[PDB]
Amino acid sequence: MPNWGGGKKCGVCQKAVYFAEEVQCEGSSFHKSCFLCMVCKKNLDSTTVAVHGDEIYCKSCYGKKYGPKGKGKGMGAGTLSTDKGESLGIKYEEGQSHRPTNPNASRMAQKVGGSDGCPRCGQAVYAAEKVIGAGKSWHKSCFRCAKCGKSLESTTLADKDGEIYCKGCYAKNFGPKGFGFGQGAGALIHSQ
């Protein structure tokens, strides 16, 4: 019954150490198992150990948290632009000409011949059937007596002041005269 003794005070777990380990530290002390890197979670039962605000950390860890991180970054830039050149054009023209007109001249001419026409039928007369009579020309076929109708030739024909007839007509028309005659009367007797 009578017993107690002494021990340490674990300011970590808040339990009194029954004199066994009572790990001491900078103005502090915790149980052995208690004294464990609260970072890596690995027990810390050796030197090279560090402490911290109500906590314990192994050197390394300490140098890890305390240690730096690294460097930052930088930057850059750049730009450029240019352009030019443009020109073009052209033009032209032309004229024209004309052409006037010139008048014309006249000429002369003349030429005649023989031959004639048929004043009877009306057609023309030139050889083949051309007759000349009464100082006129006509078709030897048409050329006939304008009294009997009997066709003529030239001589046998008779040109009466333009007119044309047959000798028989030219003669008769202008025939000679003839003597006349009469009758007498004998005598007889009567009886019964």
Binding site for Zn ion (CB under 5 A): 10, 12-13, 30-31, 34, 37, 39-40, 58, 61, 118, 120-121, 139, 142, 145, 147-148, 165-166, 169
The Cα 158–Cα 144 span in angstroms is 10
Enter the DSSP assignment of 172. H
The nearest distance, CB 114 to Zn ion, in angstroms, is 18
Residue 192: other Cβ atoms inside 10 A: 2
The Cα 29–Cα 19 span in angstroms is 12
Residue with smaller CB distance to Zn ion, 147 or 160: 147
3-state secondary structure of 55: strand
The nearest distance, CB 137 to Zn ion, in angstroms, is 10
The nearest distance, CB 170 to Zn ion, in angstroms, is 8
Give the CA count within 13 Å in the CB-facing half-sphere of 27.
Answer: 3
Residue with smaller CB distance to Zn ion, 28 or 78: 28
Residue with smaller CB distance to Zn ion, 77 or 141: 141
The nearest distance, CB 129 to Zn ion, in angstroms, is 8
Residue with smaller CB distance to Zn ion, 56 or 106: 56
Residue 139 burial (CB < 10 Å; 0-12/13-18/19+)? buried
Residue with smaller CB distance to Zn ion, 8 or 191: 8
The nearest distance, CB 44 to Zn ion, in angstroms, is 7
Spatial contact of 39 and 58, defined as CB atoms under 8 Å apart: yes
